[PDB]
Every structure is written in structure tokens, then in C-alpha cells.
Structure 1
Amino acid sequence: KTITGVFNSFDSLTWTRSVEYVYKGPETPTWNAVLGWSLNSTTADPGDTFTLILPCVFKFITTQTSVDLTADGVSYATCDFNAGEEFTTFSSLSCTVNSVSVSYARVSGTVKLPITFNVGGTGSSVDLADSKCFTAGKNTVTFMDGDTKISTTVDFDASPVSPSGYITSSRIIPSLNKLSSLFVVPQCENGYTSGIMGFVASNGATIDCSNVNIGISKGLNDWNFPVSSESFSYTKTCTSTSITVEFQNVPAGYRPFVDAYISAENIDKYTLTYANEYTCENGNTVVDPFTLTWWWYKNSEADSDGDVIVV
């Protein structure tokens, strides 16, 4: 049978600082969610199943496939991780009650889930939906076990990057062994005449042309991600080494952007070179190419200018 109500509290949600990760953004590893759970042998049998839904969670920051609900050395249930990634706007746990050698009546404990949230990152439908999950500052984070909600408050820092410049972001998609990578053109408040946007991959990275998004977004959210993806006039060329989009007239209030999946499999880091040209309406063409090295993990540690770490 299916049981509900096993996870019965959301005790704390805290960010663990690494050497390479500096601000407490929603997508920055690692947020740890500590939940309270309990089981009662009169209402749950070994092999009964239960699920926990984690809206707006992109993935679990672990290599393990499962985590156990344990107390005082004993494993009372095992929960498989099912990350949302670019498949769903939520993640979940699928859990089963375990058989045990010593019988128990009622037991309870806590479990810690290492996660990052999805507040956007590409023009995909999942990312555009989750770009509206949270705002900078105080938010309530809720998970659901059957029909019951368990909640805590959190404070998320907004991006320290100014929204009006170019934006770049790279995020690992662990189940695909790929990353997504995003580039948003600098802001032309009164619209664009034309521009060229995109990136060429080098130093171990290739672009997956089957998984690209090109759009204009009506502004960006608090972490500078696209919040919509409307139609516009452009032409594009995508190869395994380069994606380039040349666009014409974009209206005031919109920001053109391009993202694609990147494979960068046996390396600590890869390089993207961004063309970055744009012409604002009644302005002159700006040509401002730049290069970034994206590190899978770092490793340097926490360096600066041109060196950025993936989330």
C-alpha cells in the first residue's frame, strides 16, 4: 500500500558555504533541507511506499541514488532521489519502508537532503515556469507529503551581477552528463536594431544542437534569468563547436538570449567565447566579445576575472 504523512516537519533549510561558492543564491550548492519524519509499525508495513514532492528543486547535490530514513543506527526506510532537472519543475523522493531485525512501535528522526533550487537558467518550459518560484529576500519553501504541506522560511540573496550588462550562467544537468549554458544580451532599454549573440566552445566543450533555446524575454528575474520566451526575427547557425544567432528588431523591455546544452566530459574546465554585438535603437553598434573559463569544480580556489564556476 501507499502511506502518507511520513515526513511531518520541515525543520531547517540552510546553505553550506564552499571555498568556490560565495553568495547564497537559490541555485548555488549546497542547500540542506532537514526534515522530520516518523513511522508507526501499526500503520506502515515493510514494503509500503510513500513520496515526497519538492517543488522548485532542480536536483540533489549528491552522487548517491538514495538516502535512508535512519535513527540510532537503524534504517527504517530508503528514499530514491528523482531530480527535476529539465524534465520537471519539481523533484521528488520515492520511498519504501524497510524490514528491520528488531521490531519497533513508533520511531522518528530527521533526514538531510542536499539540494539546489531552480529559479531559471534557460528558455525551456520547466525553467521559465520556475523562474517565477521565488524572489530575493524572504520566502516560504514548502514540500508536500500526500495532501499535507511542510514548510519553512528562507532568505535568498539576489544575484550581485547588474541586470543591464550581459548575463552568463552554466548549470550541470547530472543525469544527462551535460551542462546548460546561457547568454543574455546587454540591455537596450529602448529596443534593439540588431545584434549577434552566442558562443563558441573550446578546450573540451562541445555544443549539443538538439537542445538549444533562443528567445526574447520580457525582463529577467532577481537572478537575471529569463522569465519568458517570445518570438522574434533572427537566423541562427549551430554546430558542435559554435552557436550564433543574428537578430533584427527587438522591442523595448525585451532581452534576447540563447542557451544550449554543452558536453564537457573529461576535464576540469572548458572555455566559451561570446561574440556579444548589439545595436540599440538609434544607437551605434557595440562589439564587446569576451571569454570565460567555466570550472566543473574549483580547484583554484574561488578565483577571479574570466574564471567562473558552474552550478
Structure 2
Amino acid sequence: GKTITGVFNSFNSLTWSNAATYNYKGPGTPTWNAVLGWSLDGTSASPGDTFTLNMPCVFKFTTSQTSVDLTAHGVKYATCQFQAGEEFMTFSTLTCTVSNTLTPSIKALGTVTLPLAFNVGGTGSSVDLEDSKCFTAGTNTVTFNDGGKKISINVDFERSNVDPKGYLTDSRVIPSLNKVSTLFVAPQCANGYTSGTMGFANTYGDVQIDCSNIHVGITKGLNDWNYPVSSESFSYTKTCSSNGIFITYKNVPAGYRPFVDAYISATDVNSYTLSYANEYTCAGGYWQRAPFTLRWTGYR
């Protein structure tokens, strides 16, 4: 076939269905249902011809769905296959093939609903650090593009309901790998850190930390959803095993936050626990040791 463009021709609505009672209206909180208009005219396109919808800053679909049909009055005019950016790419793609129903004489139009979670960060990975600059709190334009034809809508996104000066955590499922990323950022020491020890563990067997997929770094502040925006070098020593990842660090400069992340896998991804080392001394002298445990039962 040949590549055609302009098939997706409108961004009709982008509406949040907060399906896990999240306390803030975040881009990376499920689900943002995107309703797009399309049209197919037998004068332009042919069976076999393909087209691609480019979706910047889209992490994944929120359902098990991997295919979406361009259907109109109960007849299917195109098959599309969704490819999620996850930790592979900053964008997601919908790749569509015109079906044998679009003969020369057919003129068709319809809509499609896409169940979205946007990527605004969550780890020290290259994909997340780049996508940490995707949106801001407040009004945002979301633009997809099929070829040169751009389709856009304005949406309002809410900064987190969590004080960024505290310790921070995150978890998000990577559906294709059946794996979960998890983040831990130390509490803020405004004028820098003399020392600290941080990390997380699960010593009970049913959760595995994957030491081949970790990040350790200092970030120069955080974005509007409390995720890292940079990952610089700093003085620390790491231990990692399937049971936990820990770092002891020193002399982090004012304005930075040390963080660690890792993929995890669990026998119940919808219900597992992690226990945290949370000890630090701020430059100036303010000391703290406040370990804790979390039950993870929502993931983004």
C-alpha cells in the first residue's frame, strides 16, 4: 500500500475519568479519554494503504486494548494497532490499515475513543526525564499529528496534592513488560545535604527489585507532579539485590534532591509492600531518621 495522511481530522474531547480516586487531576493519572474524529474517502485512499497517528507525551493505554477500529454504522473501514511509548519512546503511535470496505465509491466518517495516560515523568530514565517537560500545571494544548495535519485541544491539568518538600514516591505499571517502576525522593534540605541514607526493600520473597533497571541521581528541583527533571552526578555508594536498593550519599548541593528508582515485579502487582530507609542530615545540621512502609495497591 501507500502512506496516506489527514485521516484523523479533529480532537473532539479529552475528558478525565478518575477511575482510582486520585487526589489531583494529573496528566499521568488514568484515564484521559481522547475522542478523535476521522474520515475516509475512496477517492483518496485504498485498501492496503496505511497511516500513522503520532501522540507526543502518551505513555500507554489504560486498558488491555492493543487494537482500535475505525468503524462507521457497524462496518470496519480501518484497523489500528496501538504502540505505547512506555520506557521505549517519548510518544505513542497508532498505526492503521485501510480495510477492503473502502472501495472507490465509499465516503465514511466516525469517531474513536482512546483511553490514555500521559507521560510527565516518574523515573530517572531518559524517556521520563525528557517527558518531565511535556506539560505544565494549568491550561495545556495537546496536539496529535497524522502526517503534516495537526489536531489539537486545550486541557487543564492539576499540580499534585502532595507537598514537594516531603519525601516523595511514585509507582507506575509498564503493561507490556508486566513490570512496575517505583520512585523514592528524599525529603528536601533546602541548603543541601551533609549526608543521608535512602532506598527501599521487600524482604518477603514475593516482590523482586530488578537491579538491572535502576536509577540513582540528584535532580535540580521537580516538575509540577513531583518527578525528577534532571539526573546529575553526586557522591554515593549503592547496594542492590532482589530484596532492596539502598544508597548512602554526601555533600549534595543546595537546590538538588537525591532520588532512586527501580522496576519491581510482584506476585500481586495490585497489592504489595515496600519498606523505606529515610535518614538524612541537612547542611546546617538538621538531622532526621523516619523509616516507613507503604502498601502499593494503586499504580499509575
Asked if 2 retains the 8 angstrom alpha-carbon contact of 1:202 and 1:270, the reply is no
Stretches of 4+ aligned residues off by more than 6 angstroms = none
- Residue 229 of structure 2 corresponds to 227
- Spell out, residue by residue over 1:33-85, the C-alpha distance to the aligned partner (whole angstroms, 9 max, x if none): 11110001111111110000100000011212200011111111011010000
Amino acid at match of 1:61: T
CA distance in 1, matches of 2:268, 2:169: 22
Amino acid at match of 2:160: S
Q: Report the alpha carbon displacement of residue 283 of structure 1 after superposing the two structures with TM.
A: 1.4
Asked if 2 retains the 8 angstrom alpha-carbon contact of 1:79 and 1:96, the reply is yes
- Residue 240 of structure 2 corresponds to 238
Amino acid at match of 1:209: C
- Residue 294 of structure 2 corresponds to 292
- Residue 116 of structure 1 corresponds to 117
CA distance in 2, matches of 1:74, 1:21: 38
Give the direction of change, closer, same or farther, for the CA distance of 1:3–1:103 in structure 2 (3 Å limit). closer
Q: Counterparts in 2 of 1:7-26, with a 5 A limit?
A: 7-26=8-27
- Residue 42 of structure 1 corresponds to 43
Identity between Structure 1 and Structure 2 (%): 68
Q: Which of 63-72 and 247-256 deviates more?
A: 63-72
Q: Which of 99-108 and 135-144 deviates more?
A: 99-108
CA distance in 1, matches of 2:21, 2:158: 16
Give the direction of change, closer, same or farther, for the CA distance of 1:23–1:234 in structure 2 (3 Å limit). same
Answering whether residue 123 of structure 2 is matched by residue 134 of structure 1, we say: no
- Residue 197 of structure 2 corresponds to 196
- Spell out, residue by residue over 1:232-277, the C-alpha distance to the aligned partner (whole angstroms, 9 max, x if none): 0100000001000110110000000000000114453110111111
Give the direction of change, closer, same or farther, for the CA distance of 1:241–1:226 in structure 2 (3 Å limit). same
- Residue 66 of structure 1 corresponds to 67
Asked if 2 retains the 8 angstrom alpha-carbon contact of 1:191 and 1:249, the reply is yes
Q: Which of 276-285 and 223-232 deviates more?
A: 276-285
- Residue 299 of structure 1 corresponds to none
- RMSD over aligned Cα atoms: 1.4
CA distance in 1, matches of 2:290, 2:102: 66
- Which ranges of structure 1 fall in alignment gaps of 5 or more residues? 296-308
CA distance in 2, matches of 1:250, 1:101: 62
- Spell out, residue by residue over 1:181-219, the C-alpha distance to the aligned partner (whole angstroms, 9 max, x if none): 000001000000011111002552210000000000000
Task: Report the 3-state secondary structure (helix = DSSP H, G, I; strand = E; otherwise coil) of the residue aligned with 1:39.
Answer: strand
Asked if 2 retains the 8 angstrom alpha-carbon contact of 1:119 and 1:134, the reply is yes
Asked if 2 retains the 8 angstrom alpha-carbon contact of 1:138 and 1:156, the reply is yes
CA distance in 1, matches of 2:292, 2:285: 21
TM-score after normalising by structure 1: 0.93
Task: Report the 3-state secondary structure (helix = DSSP H, G, I; strand = E; otherwise coil) of the residue aligned with 1:225.
Answer: coil
Q: Report the alpha carbon displacement of residue 147 of structure 1 after superposing the two structures with TM.
A: 1.2
- Residue 145 of structure 1 corresponds to 146
Give the direction of change, closer, same or farther, for the CA distance of 1:232–1:152 in structure 2 (3 Å limit). same
Asked if 2 retains the 8 angstrom alpha-carbon contact of 1:59 and 1:115, the reply is yes
TM-score after normalising by structure 2: 0.96
CA distance in 1, matches of 2:257, 2:22: 27
CA distance in 1, matches of 2:19, 2:162: 19
Q: How many aligned residue pairs are there?
A: 298
CA distance in 2, matches of 1:141, 1:90: 12
CA distance in 2, matches of 1:35, 1:102: 23
Amino acid at match of 2:126: S
Asked if 2 retains the 8 angstrom alpha-carbon contact of 1:202 and 1:271, the reply is no
Q: Report the alpha carbon displacement of residue 157 of structure 1 after superposing the two structures with TM.
A: 0.9
Q: Report the alpha carbon displacement of residue 103 of structure 1 after superposing the two structures with TM.
A: 7.3
- Residue 253 of structure 2 corresponds to 251
Task: Report the 3-state secondary structure (helix = DSSP H, G, I; strand = E; otherwise coil) of the residue aligned with 1:133.
Answer: coil
